[PDB]
Structures are given as structure tokens and as C-alpha cells.
Subunit: 199 residues, 2 copies
């Protein structure tokens, strides 16, 4: 069943405890979300630069980066309308945690990087969906719009991993990262971030 459904692909749902913390501090959530959109754009560019002879990756990543930059700009606009000031919010543990599972040897270092991307995007999709019933109208609508783009990016990242890797080795990678990702989501965490664990 190539490219499963979001809840099938993921190892756990977003905890209610995370949701409660998120609702109690929507301003730091927004700030971190803004930063996540940007980071996704910059990650895409770093991939283009590392894999500069991989034409398929380059063309998908350049387009993806533009989409993520639109989202970054939209989060900024919404922050502006609602009087949310900018302030520094350092990166959470999640994406680094997953990047540590990545192997050091090409070409498998690439397929793993892309599987990690598929997980980040799948989780963002699931987590937006968990959030939107609890938000005000304009925020819920914005986040609903985003969750649909996250589902496409999840597919995009998995398709690209299959473009450069073998079914079995990917299936192995997905199993290893699934477990690591569940642990980061379910484990306790000393901070609120979009992809933090339970506080």
C-alpha cells in the first residue's frame, strides 16, 4: 500500500496534553510555526545545494521552497493582524532528533533524509487537524488550508524517496523513523513548540 494514509503512516496521534498547552499559548505556537515554514524553505534549499546534480529533487525542492515561503509570509500577516510581536524562539528538539537517525553513506543518506521529511510533513498535517476544532474561525480556516498542503508534501517527499531508493530499504527506514518520531511526540518536553512532546 504505497504512500499510506496519514494516521496509518504515523506511529501515534497528537496527545491531548500537547493540545491543551498549545491552546494556552497560541502566540509562541504561531511564532514557532512561522519559523517552521521558513526552516522548511531553507532545508529545501540546502538539499538543492547538497544534491545539485539530482534534477528531479532540484525542481521539486525549488517549487516546495516557494510554497513554504508563501506560508511563512501568511503566518507573518496573521501575526501582524492579531498584534503578535516577533521575538526569538529557538528551534525545538524534533527535526534534529529525527536527523540523527539519518545514515552517513550515499545514496542511502538521501533516501533517509527524504523519509524524515515525509514524517515531519505527515505530523504537521495530523497536528493541524487535531488543532482546528479548538481554534477561532480565521485561524481554523488558515490551518485547514495548510493541512491539505502538508498532505501533498508528505506524498511528495515519499514519492521522491522511492525515486532514489529500493522498496525494502525505504520500508526499513520508515519503520525506524516511525518509532523515533513517536518517542519525540509522546515523551515529555520542557518547552512548547509546534512539534514538541507533552509538557
Amino acid at each position: 500500500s504505497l504512500i499510506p494514509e496519514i494516521d496509518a503512516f504515523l506511529g501515534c496521534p497528537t496527545p491531548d496534553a500537547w493540545i491543551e498547552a498549545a491552546l494556552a499559548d497560541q502566540e509562541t505556537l504561531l511564532i514557532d510555526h512561522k519559523n517552521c515554514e521558513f526552516k522548511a524553505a531553507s532545508t529545501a534549499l540546502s538539499l538543492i545545494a547538497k544534491y545539485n546534480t539530482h534534477l528531479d529533487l532540484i525542481n521539486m525542492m525549488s517549487r516546495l521552497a516557494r510554497e513554504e515561503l508563501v506560508h511563512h509570509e501568511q503566518v507573518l500577516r496573521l501575526m501582524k493582524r492579531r498584534g503578535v510581536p516577533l521575538r526569538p524562539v529557538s528551534a525545538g528538539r524534533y527535526a534534529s532528533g529525527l536527523r540523527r537517525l539519518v545514515r552517513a553513506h550515499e545514496p542511502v543518506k538521501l533516501v533517509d533524509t527524504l523519509v524524515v521529511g515525509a514524517f515531519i510533513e505527515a505530523r504537521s498535517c495530523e497536528r493541524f487537524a487535531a488543532l482546528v476544532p479548538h481554534l477561532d474561525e480565521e485561524l481554523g480556516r488558515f490551518y485547514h488550508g495548510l493541512l491539505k498542503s502538508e498532505a501533498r508534501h508528505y506524498q511528495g517527499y515519499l514519492k521522491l524517496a522511492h525515486n532514489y531508493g529500493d522498496e525494502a530499504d525505504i520500508a526499513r527506514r520508515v519503520e525506524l523513523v516511525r518509532a523515533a518520531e513517536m518517542e519525540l511526540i509522546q515523551s515529555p518536553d520542557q518547552e512548547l513548540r509546534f512539534h514538541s512532546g507533552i509538557p
Copy 2:
């Protein structure tokens, strides 16, 4: 205010540069492609550095998207013309100009933006020098990129004035003009879009 391009710049593109470029248009295309990418990349690095300057962040996010569209257009054109994706290392020009930037704020930022204005202004002037010597499709593509380069030159300089200091900008402009002219007029071992004179 904002000077016209030839007035802002310290010299025209030498005729010897143009001769070299026309004899090696595959390398020029690949480098051009890389420059569009590097411009998006630089724009993102600025957002990450100046992650609280709202005007900077909004201009730079938009600018990156536009630069990535151009990255993609040059790739399309490379594909139609059988230009392979071979690595071409970065020329001296951009890093030569950055060496001029002072280490201290808020003047490190102004400096960086004026370097930005010079790179964009030179790209505009150099595309215009090339257009009349190129085939139909390249001529039209490079002509369509002139307008945006002039606008980006405008944008960077306007943003410099947002964070300066009429006198301080004027002194920085005078200094970068000199170095930039020297980077363009001096002999260079490599053909790039922003290389100096051959030999």
C-alpha cells in the same frame, strides 16, 4: 534618491568579458542558474540573521520566491538546449564584496544591503550588454530579467535607507563602488556571470 544603473555603477561591462561569455554560453547559463539560487539562499540567510526586522523579512521572503522562479526558468532553458548539470564553482565577485562589510551593527546590515544593490545593478547592466549579441530566445529571456534586476537594485537600496543614515550609506556606496569596479575591470582566470576580464 535611486540613481540610474550606469550612474550607480563604477564601469561598464568590458567588451572582452562579452567576447568570452559568447564563446562559452553553457558555462554562463549554469553559473546564471547558480546565481539565481545563491540570491534566494542569501535572502533566506538575511531573514535568519535579522529575524525580528519585519520590513527586511517580508521583502526578503518575496525576493527569494522571485529568485527561485528564475532559478527554475534557467533550468528549463538548460533542459531545452542540452546543457548538462555540471558543477561550476562560485566566482570571486560576491565574496570579494562581502569582505568589505563591517562586523558591527546596525552598520553591518546597511553594508550588506548596499552590496546587494551593487550585485543586482551589475546583473541588470550586464544582461543588457549581452541581449543584443544572443539568439532570439536567450535575448528575450535575458531582456525580461532586466526589469526585475533593476527593481531588486531599487529594493535593496531603499531598504538600506530604511536602516541608515544618508551620509553613512553614501560613504558605504562610494567604497563598494570602488571595489566592485576593481572586481569587474581586473583580470580573472575563470568565466562567470560576474567574472573580471579574461587572462
